[PDB]
Amino acid sequence: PQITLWKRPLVTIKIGGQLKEALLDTGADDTIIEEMSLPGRWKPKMVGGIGGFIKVRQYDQIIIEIAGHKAIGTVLVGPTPINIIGRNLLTQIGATLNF
Amino acid sequence: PQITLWKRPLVTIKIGGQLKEALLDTGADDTIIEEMSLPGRWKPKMVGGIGGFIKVRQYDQIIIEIAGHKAIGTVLVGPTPINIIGRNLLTQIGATLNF
Numbered sequence: 292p293q294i295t296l297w298k299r300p301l302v303t304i305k306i307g308g309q310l311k312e313a314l315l316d317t318g319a320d321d322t323i324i325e326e327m328s329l330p331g332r333w334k335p336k337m338v339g340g341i342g343g344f345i346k347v348r349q350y351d352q353i354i355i356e357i358a359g360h361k362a363i364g365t366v367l368v369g370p371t372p373i374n375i376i377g378r379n380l381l382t383q384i385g386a387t388l389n390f
Numbered sequence: 391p392q393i394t395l396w397k398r399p400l401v402t403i404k405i406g407g408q409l410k411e412a413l414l415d416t417g418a419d420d421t422i423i424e425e426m427s428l429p430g431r432w433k434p435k436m437v438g439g440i441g442g443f444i445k446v447r448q449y450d451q452i453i454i455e456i457a458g459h460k461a462i463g464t465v466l467v468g469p470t471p472i473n474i475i476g477r478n479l480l481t482q483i484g485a486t487l488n489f
């Protein structure tokens with residue numbers, strides 16, 4: 292699709308068998324999801340933004356369906372105030388910014 | 391242009407006659423610039439992000455060039471980790487997300 296930016300670019304995702312709403316975020320290097328369970332091993336990570344840093348769990352090789360497009364990559368899980376799809380998965384669905 | 395997301399979507403902006411680097415950020419409602427001097431009166435705003443809130447100064451009807459495109463609109467000034475061009479100005483330059 293072509294997504295205008297008058298409103299937040301929110302989409303439905305499927306992750307870990309669960310449907311969630313998430314923000315398509317070109318300013319995010321990484322994908323950050325609210326607390327949930329994911330399979331496999333994880334390692335701790337700190338991610339920083341406006342406000343400071345939060346501690347997350349890093350899961351590698353996670354499959355997400357993003358507005359119907361499958362992508363695999365790293366997902367960070369922790370106390371984000373919004374689910375964020377970052378560039379590490381936006382590239383895999385072919386997303387570009389155009390003007 | 392068409393901006394892919396394999397790298398951060400960094401562009402040059404011009405504000406107050408000065409060139410700065412900024413991130414094109416679809417996840418940002420608002421445009422936030424590092425401490426600098428802007429003309430006129432300001433209003434208070436709290437901005438929430440991944441790791442809590444920051445206080446900023448809100449300046450309205452500021453002239454800013456973004457990757458060669460003229461915009462005139464609200465700029466928040468404060469302790470952002472990076473200059474962010476949010477949707478309020480991305481809509482003025484005609485940016486869309488496409489996949």
Ligand SMILES: CN[C@H]1CO[C@@H]2OC[C@H](OC(=O)N[C@@H](Cc3ccccc3)[C@H](O)CN(CC(C)C)S(=O)(=O)c3ccc(OC)cc3)[C@@H]21
Pocket residue numbers: 314316317318319320321322323338339340341372373375377413415416417418419420421422437438439440441471472474476
């Ligand atoms: C609610 N208020 C926010 C929304 O609109 C306002 O505009 C400014 C601020 O927006 C944000 O902080 N937006 C976040 C994304 C965002 C969105 C909403 C809440 C939290 C975060 C942004 O798009 C992505 N981030 C960083 C930029 C600040 C550099 S981040 O969430 O901190 C982030 C950092 C590192 C990551 O990987 C290393 C992945 C994500 C305000």
